[PDB]
Amino acid sequence: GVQLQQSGPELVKPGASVKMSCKASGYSFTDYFMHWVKQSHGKSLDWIGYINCYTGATNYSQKFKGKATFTVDTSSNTAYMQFNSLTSEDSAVYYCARTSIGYGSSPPFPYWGQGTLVTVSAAKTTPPSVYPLAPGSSMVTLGCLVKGYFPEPVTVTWNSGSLSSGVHTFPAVLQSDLYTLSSSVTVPSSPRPSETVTCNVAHPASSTKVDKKIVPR
Amino acid sequence: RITLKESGPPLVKPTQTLTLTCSFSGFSLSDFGVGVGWIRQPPGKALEWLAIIYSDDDKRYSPSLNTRLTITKDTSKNQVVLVMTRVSPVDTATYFCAHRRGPTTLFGVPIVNAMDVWGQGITVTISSTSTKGPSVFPLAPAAALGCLVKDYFPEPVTVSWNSGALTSGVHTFPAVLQSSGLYSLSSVVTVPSSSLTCNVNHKPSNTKVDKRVE
Amino acid sequence: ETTVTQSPASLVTIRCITSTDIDDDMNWYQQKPGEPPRLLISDGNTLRPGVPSRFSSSGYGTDFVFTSEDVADYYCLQSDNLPYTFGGGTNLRADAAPTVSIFPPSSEQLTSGGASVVCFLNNFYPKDINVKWKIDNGVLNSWTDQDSKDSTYSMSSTLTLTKDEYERHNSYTCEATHKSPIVKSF
Amino acid sequence: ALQLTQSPSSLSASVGDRITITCRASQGVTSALAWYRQKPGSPPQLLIYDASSLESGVPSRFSGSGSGTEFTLTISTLRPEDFATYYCQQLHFYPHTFGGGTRVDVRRTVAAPSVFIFPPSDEQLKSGTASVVCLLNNFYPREAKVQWKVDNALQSGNSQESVTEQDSKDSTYSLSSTLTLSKADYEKHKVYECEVTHQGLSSPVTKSFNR
């Protein structure tokens, strides 16, 4: 099965440069073209350009020119993208999509990559403070409060993925250069306190990964 | 009357890039639903569809060359350029550029299944080999005999007998590409046993040889 | 350029008119939350093999058309000429009462001089909901995308007070006014 | 990828005859098929488009039917010029794949070839390389193979061959083989043979010589 594996999240200060990858699998790398699409927080979809994957030939959008620089590596079936002079408007999700056979360098884009998140700012990366949310003295809702962290993203699971039902993880919000996120989990009023319930929140940016057991008050 | 003509380098070295142009008249890429595609044909092989471009600038390339072929049109100059990068010995063949009729319109709306007009075809040879004259060896013994135009490059090479006096029974087979990257053909002639010179000429290497066969 | 305009941007039939005329070079992508877009249709309405028949891409020239697991943003893509341009896109049940839940500050937070009181309002419909933080500004609200199973919504209100600020009051409430306001306190 | 297998690939016919060519596609192709008639030197020529529609200025002996996954090109009365190769192209999907081709030659009584073996002439040996060419002259059908032997040592991979175009009169064929061996290797061995196998031969014929 075709698969475009995009590098993890990044965080750079304005004017700094970032380079992201896009490793392919399940198909002949050098037979297609790889494009790079940008998607602002707002949910737009800008075209950055494409790469040949075989000859290395490239083409950009007069808008991203000079700023974006595509690169390709045949030995590792990997596509790269160099971003320079980054502003706050660059803080978006960058994708890499492969073309269809016969169309050449033009779309459609049958396959897309994970998607790389990029945050540009001078704010210092701060680890999150996870707080357990136990009901104040048939279904019982519990949760965790991930406060004061930077930058995005943050992975929060329950019982290491065990609990997947009745789980609601809300979008982080900004408190002046610092995020705050929460997550709730509904479970029948029996596996708790009887059985253990824990939230697993990870902040890659700071390599932080803490578990918090929700005990009664 | 529609006309088409392929133009470009008759010879190219491996890895380099080949650029073929299709000159035409009798219609314009301004015409609706009209396209111009390319069809390649290796020596003694079947036809292979390469690509095709339309008035609307649409383009489609053979899955095999999806990243080596680039088709462009010059609506003005009435031309259609095709660029093939990283060429190899497997790309030597005759390239034809045909025209595809357009869909019947109705006030400008389509309401085509073939390449009605073709070109003359241009022969291209992808090789690194250098030009050199052919060696002529005799094929001494109805009765048969002939000459072996050896190790030459590139095609073609004209061969006649006795300044033309001979024809009956002469068989000049098509050259073969040797491992050397050079060619080699044999021109025989069958005549009466009781009846007991090949005029070889290699244009490029200006190698003209009229050997005798005893 | 080829300014592509989608319509509506929220609300099935979608529209996408372009600044320039072209072939049927207009793709359609479906994008669900947390993941990349999915190819649905290519140049000249060609449903990507493996996609429901419920999808079709009528249209040609400049005016194109597109007609619980379809909740996502749909985007048009012009495959004509550079720069390849997308559109503004457009995101796509029985009313349900919000299951509110109030949570007092954690011992760990209080130890840091902080104190936040959370209020979860899950699986409700529609999204239009009003929360009232009544004790005896400083609040945060976050809404989740429409559930791709029960098509319900959910939000969490976080009232943030100081350690002392929280200690001089022994009654916190977060009333939820949704289509009598649901009260819940401690 | 899609495939267009033409059937037959080669056939024998006579002037003023009736023949039929088929074009099978691995996948549906509506009526987006065309047939071309190509003759050496000149580019292919469109005969029938849209599967049934007959091109402009094209004879009537050319008829086209079929639809879906199989079509057929029928020639009522085979004229002379009609002796060539025919291809079929589908234009429903991309690429617009062409057919393998079908060889339409002239049907004529069997004709065993005349094998002539030619040893490597000196002058050439004076360059380290030796060439041993074998000649099959005026035979039929075009199907025939050559097998080289060096002291009863079946050679393989070190021999190329070429075939001529059916004679405009003889309507026959001729093959030219060539056994290339280094002078050194040549010198050692002595019995060089060229065994030709062809329909028109009750048994394989073998022409040989000694250094």
Short mmCIF file of C-alpha atoms in Angstrom, two decimals, chain D residues 53-159:
data_model
loop_
_atom_site.label_atom_id
_atom_site.label_comp_id
_atom_site.label_asym_id
_atom_site.label_seq_id
_atom_site.Cartn_x
_atom_site.Cartn_y
_atom_site.Cartn_z
CA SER D 53 -16.92 4.64 -38.53
CA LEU D 54 -14.91 4.45 -41.76
CA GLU D 55 -12.30 7.20 -42.27
CA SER D 56 -12.50 9.66 -45.18
CA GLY D 57 -11.13 8.52 -48.53
CA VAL D 58 -10.65 5.00 -47.20
CA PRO D 59 -11.64 2.00 -49.38
CA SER D 60 -14.77 -0.06 -48.72
CA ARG D 61 -13.10 -3.46 -48.47
CA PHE D 62 -12.25 -2.24 -44.97
CA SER D 63 -15.00 -2.89 -42.43
CA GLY D 64 -14.95 -2.51 -38.66
CA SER D 65 -17.20 -4.07 -36.04
CA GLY D 66 -17.07 -5.24 -32.44
CA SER D 67 -17.69 -3.35 -29.21
CA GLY D 68 -16.79 -3.56 -25.54
CA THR D 69 -13.84 -5.90 -25.07
CA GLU D 70 -13.39 -7.24 -28.61
CA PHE D 71 -13.51 -5.81 -32.11
CA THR D 72 -12.69 -7.06 -35.61
CA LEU D 73 -11.29 -5.53 -38.80
CA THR D 74 -12.58 -7.25 -41.94
CA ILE D 75 -11.17 -6.95 -45.45
CA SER D 76 -13.71 -8.03 -48.08
CA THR D 77 -11.49 -8.23 -51.16
CA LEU D 78 -7.75 -8.08 -50.45
CA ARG D 79 -6.11 -5.65 -52.87
CA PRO D 80 -2.33 -5.64 -53.44
CA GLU D 81 -1.42 -2.55 -51.39
CA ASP D 82 -3.28 -4.14 -48.47
CA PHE D 83 -0.35 -6.47 -47.79
CA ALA D 84 1.25 -4.97 -44.68
CA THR D 85 0.97 -4.70 -40.89
CA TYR D 86 -2.17 -3.60 -39.08
CA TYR D 87 -2.51 -2.19 -35.56
CA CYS D 88 -5.43 -1.33 -33.29
CA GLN D 89 -5.48 1.54 -30.82
CA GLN D 90 -7.82 2.16 -27.90
CA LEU D 91 -8.45 5.75 -26.81
CA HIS D 92 -10.81 5.23 -23.87
CA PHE D 93 -8.12 5.20 -21.18
CA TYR D 94 -4.61 6.62 -21.01
CA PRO D 95 -2.23 5.64 -22.38
CA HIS D 96 -3.91 5.15 -25.75
CA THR D 97 -2.33 1.70 -26.04
CA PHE D 98 -1.64 0.29 -29.50
CA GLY D 99 -1.94 -3.32 -30.57
CA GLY D 100 0.94 -5.71 -31.07
CA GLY D 101 0.40 -5.77 -34.82
CA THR D 102 -0.61 -8.35 -37.42
CA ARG D 103 1.55 -9.40 -40.38
CA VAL D 104 -0.36 -9.86 -43.63
CA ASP D 105 1.95 -11.32 -46.30
CA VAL D 106 1.31 -13.29 -49.50
CA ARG D 107 0.20 -16.93 -49.43
CA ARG D 108 2.37 -19.11 -51.66
CA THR D 109 3.34 -22.79 -52.00
CA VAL D 110 5.98 -23.99 -49.54
CA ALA D 111 9.55 -23.20 -50.61
CA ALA D 112 12.57 -24.76 -48.91
CA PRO D 113 15.53 -22.36 -48.48
CA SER D 114 18.92 -22.70 -50.17
CA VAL D 115 21.61 -22.71 -47.49
CA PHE D 116 24.99 -21.18 -48.32
CA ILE D 117 27.74 -21.23 -45.70
CA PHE D 118 30.48 -18.59 -45.87
CA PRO D 119 33.75 -19.05 -43.96
CA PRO D 120 35.62 -16.09 -42.43
CA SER D 121 37.72 -14.60 -45.21
CA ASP D 122 41.34 -13.75 -44.49
CA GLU D 123 42.05 -10.01 -44.43
CA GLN D 124 39.43 -10.05 -41.68
CA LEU D 125 41.29 -12.62 -39.60
CA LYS D 126 44.13 -10.12 -39.92
CA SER D 127 42.17 -8.09 -37.37
CA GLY D 128 41.57 -10.77 -34.76
CA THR D 129 37.88 -11.24 -35.53
CA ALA D 130 36.25 -13.96 -37.62
CA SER D 131 32.76 -13.92 -39.10
CA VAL D 132 30.89 -16.99 -40.34
CA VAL D 133 27.75 -16.03 -42.25
CA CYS D 134 25.08 -18.48 -43.39
CA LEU D 135 22.49 -17.76 -46.08
CA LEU D 136 18.96 -19.09 -46.50
CA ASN D 137 17.67 -17.88 -49.85
CA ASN D 138 14.13 -17.61 -51.17
CA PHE D 139 12.04 -19.70 -48.80
CA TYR D 140 8.51 -19.73 -47.41
CA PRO D 141 7.00 -19.13 -44.93
CA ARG D 142 9.04 -16.43 -43.19
CA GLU D 143 9.31 -18.89 -40.29
CA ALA D 144 12.72 -20.59 -40.28
CA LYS D 145 15.63 -20.96 -37.86
CA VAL D 146 19.40 -21.38 -38.05
CA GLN D 147 21.55 -23.44 -35.69
CA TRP D 148 25.34 -23.09 -35.66
CA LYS D 149 27.69 -25.92 -34.70
CA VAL D 150 31.45 -25.90 -34.11
CA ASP D 151 32.75 -29.48 -34.10
CA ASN D 152 29.25 -30.54 -33.07
CA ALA D 153 29.17 -27.81 -30.43
CA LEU D 154 25.77 -26.12 -30.55
CA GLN D 155 26.48 -22.39 -30.38
CA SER D 156 24.15 -19.95 -28.61
CA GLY D 157 23.99 -16.23 -27.94
CA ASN D 158 26.92 -15.42 -30.21
CA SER D 159 24.91 -15.23 -33.44
#
